[PDB]
Symmetry: D2
Subunit: 295 residues, 4 copies
């Protein structure tokens, strides 16, 4: 037998950073969870009990904190590129570094109509994420995403015209609830290295903002024929607004809200045009995925 693939490192590394403006007194906070897994000439740690090739996972943890102290942590695409580049440059025998970052929201509070200099709120579990793969000889591959963006529209969603056979019970509908948890990922052109990533830094926050704005406006304004049709419109608009992304991927659950027939009780009418009270269903759920690229 032989090792065909291997990677190891430190997961679930929580990191906070503060920036303090001492002339204005304004503070800004950043919080993330980081994972770094390394690849390289490490097979003998597995086959021969040779730990000399292991950069200890504790040391990887230390390196995350040191890198955050000495470098910007925003945008996360940049921080992950800096961090992954470090491992392949510092260690001759390490040839790839896989950096995953989850960014947590800390939104400045408004108090009596004025932004507060040092107080923040977690407005939602929506995350901004990156996956940064730094591969020696191959450059830096970045996937950026937003996840956990939970939305609902109460009308202007439809689902009719689907295949019907002996397995089908679902009724067609011209007016339903649509609710989902948005997971949207944009895949950047390969970067040759850290210099090229730095050259595009303003594009990372701009493109996250565009993706979020397109997602919300299209969800709200599309009189949706299906999750499939609406998600494609989102993806195509994001591609049209950033030439440096190659693909946009969505993964969307269809979090079902079922009508409740109450007509067995005093003739109460709660279906169709009379539908007011619904039963949100925890499981099962539809799951719809698409990756859109340029022709």
């Amino acid at each position: 037998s032989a090792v065909k693939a291997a990677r190891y490192g430190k997961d679930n590394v929580r990191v906070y950073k503060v920036h303090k403006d001492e002339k204005t007194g304004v503070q800004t906070v950043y919080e993330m969870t980081v994972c770094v897994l390394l690849e390289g000439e490490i097979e003998t740690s597995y086959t021969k009990a040779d730990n000399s090739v292991i950069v200890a996972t504790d040391s990887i943890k230390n390196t995350i904190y040191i890198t955050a102290k000495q470098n910007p942590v925003t945008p996360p695409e940049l921080f992950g590129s800096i961090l992954g580049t470090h491992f392949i440059e510092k260690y001759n025998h390490i040839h790839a570094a896989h950096v995953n970052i989850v960014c947590h929201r800390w939104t400045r509070m408004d108090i009596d109509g004025k932004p507060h200099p040092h107080s923040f709120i977690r407005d939602s579990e929506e995350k901004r994420n990156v996956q940064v793969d730094v591969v020696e000889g191959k450059g830096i591959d970045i996937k950026s995403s937003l996840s956990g963006l939970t939305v609902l529209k109460s009308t202007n969603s439809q689902f009719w015209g689907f295949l019907r056979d002996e397995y089908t019970t679902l009724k067609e509908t011209w007016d339903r609830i649509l609710s989902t948890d948005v997971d949207a990922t944009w895949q950047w052109k390969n970067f040759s290295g850290l210099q090229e990533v730095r050259s595009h830094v303003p594009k990372f926050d701009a493109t996250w903002a565009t993706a979020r704005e397109v997602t919300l406006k299209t969800f709200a304004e599309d009189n949706s024929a299906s999750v499939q049709a609406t998600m494609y419109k989102m993806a195509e608009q994001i591609l049209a607004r950033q030439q440096l992304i190659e693909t946009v991927e969505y993964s969307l659950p269809n979090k079902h809200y079922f009508e409740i027939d109450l007509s067995w009780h005093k003739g109460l009418q709660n279906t169709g045009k009379n539908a007011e009270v619904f039963a949100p269903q925890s499981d099962p759920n539809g799951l719809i995925k698409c990756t859109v690229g340029r022709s």
Copy 2:
């Protein structure tokens, strides 16, 4: 042996309701999770296999949906009072109904600067809750709360002057991070019944809003001597602004953010005035509780 206490019912009942304005086209949504547990002359279901005294939990579930169809679901204090009153009035042998409601956020989206008529976002897992105990012969006891309001301030928190003995290692500090998940509960005066609850309906949303505003402004503006001192100021202000509440309770974790000494690495300075990068700690956590009433 004998039954000393018993209650039973249906938990984890998810409920959605929509309101549609057909003149303006504006829709508004409400979503909750409901639990109803009943008490009364039910002991023989336990001791003698006598199911005649059991209102089936499935029937309790049906009743929740019917009640939501026929009545307002907001404010939740009102809905829970309506629902609990129903069981003690409908069933002679049922003498108490315990109704817990968790309200989930669906905040109207703003699209290009204008509120959208039918699209919503889950801005945060913060909940608005009620516990409504309807007890025949004793009235209606309501506890209202906000929970899951997660906040952080980056300075203007201190903790010094605590007891020091042979168990103490913690250093005093004049500048630390303070972060918590706010659980705040206000206990209303006993209401004699549903009519009295209805008479105070505008006070429920007003008091929730006051509690939230006081919590956030006091957290943001208090140069905090301890979690204890800051939470008391919140509670006293809420009591001063609503005569119909008797007590305010807070339960606050102290979600610790630890400094990280990096001076073992190239003399890097990351403590005290130089502290920039911190390690958020998942566990353990301080837990601080207070119930404040009027003198």
Copy 3:
């Protein structure tokens, strides 16, 4: 305003302990999560920013570890009594200590039919818990429990003869699945102090074992008329086997498994005597509670 109630301390303190027999080489492990909250003359920490009365929560954490080093951690009733007694004896102004302990399973592995000296498996998330309230001048109040014991029987559960009215849709049944997560708590006679707790130490593990054995045998062998009827039989047997407990409480969800009518598909028969495939329901769920004492 004034403080009506207050308690504070450290929650979510994870603790492991090992015992090593150096003559036999046999090691035994214990793992728990501990919470300690203190009460006493602490109100001025809230009202006057007086931290002198605060035993820091960090110091409470240290004390948990020190107590585990110097004392047995099993049975948990004993450890919690030792720990809570410490705070009210050490600190004049602390008058109650509330200790909650969750014990995690580490069951010795059997390897080729022989118990292994130092390897363990988490067989299940079932917990053994205690709540120990040490109150100066009032003694020690102990509640012991098992929780997270998840069971299912595929027949010999019935539910018929319940109340039927205009809210009722549930069909009677003479053969259903019954599945639950057992939460069972036994409340000990008040103990005067730590000496009396020590005098009864063998009874704690014995009574936990009896409660577990009675729960499982009664669940398995009762042709159940309802959750209510079966849980009462468990409670009465536990009371009959330990004179030093005053009450037994059960809290049992009814985790529903719904029949699936497939007769719309090729006449397939999957209900009643033909029921083979079921849909487990995540929510809602029945919730049935009882506290049983002696007459």
Copy 4:
């Protein structure tokens, strides 16, 4: 723009099945969670609002239940192969079916030393899983796994001889705790279709049993030089015992248990040979991965 990849279906489908022996009275239960995602000529559902190509996710759900009624649900490799084959044979335009199954434990209870005919316990959240990819023209690709197998050994784990530089603080150790959650996956040779899967049916349960037995015996008996070294020994033994698997993959967290220095308190000795009480760490955690194949 154009669709580059797409799949859709139903996730989180809970399924129970019972087998009843009416001659012996012995019942046996099976419970799973299923996901089915389909691929094929579905792009126009995304780009042109053409729902004619969509097999509704509700219909996929129905099909899961029907398939479980008409076919064995064990071993899960077989059930998933049957289910995925159905979609590519039934629907001309569907060309792949991706079936994921999580099997939940229901272990028969022993009551007074005898196996009970119809009562079961969830002994642990350990899962047995399959991923079955049925691809028209390409056969059936099966990955089998066990996950959530949580273990701890209290000695006979070491970690020394790792790389040391200016990022390293970790001390070498010759005696530590090792605890992990085992995720082990075995990748079968490609099968040409359902007939070939059926021909190997006894091998699926046999190989799961071998993987579990090898994992536990090797964990318990290896005086471990690292997680890396121990996991490789497991993988090589599993490959040696089943010629029809091509690779074995492990993913193992190193769930750290930290020593607690108490010597600041009365000189208490709790490190090194005196280490008795430890602090389990929830995060961060090492994460070690390997894929082993044959040379």
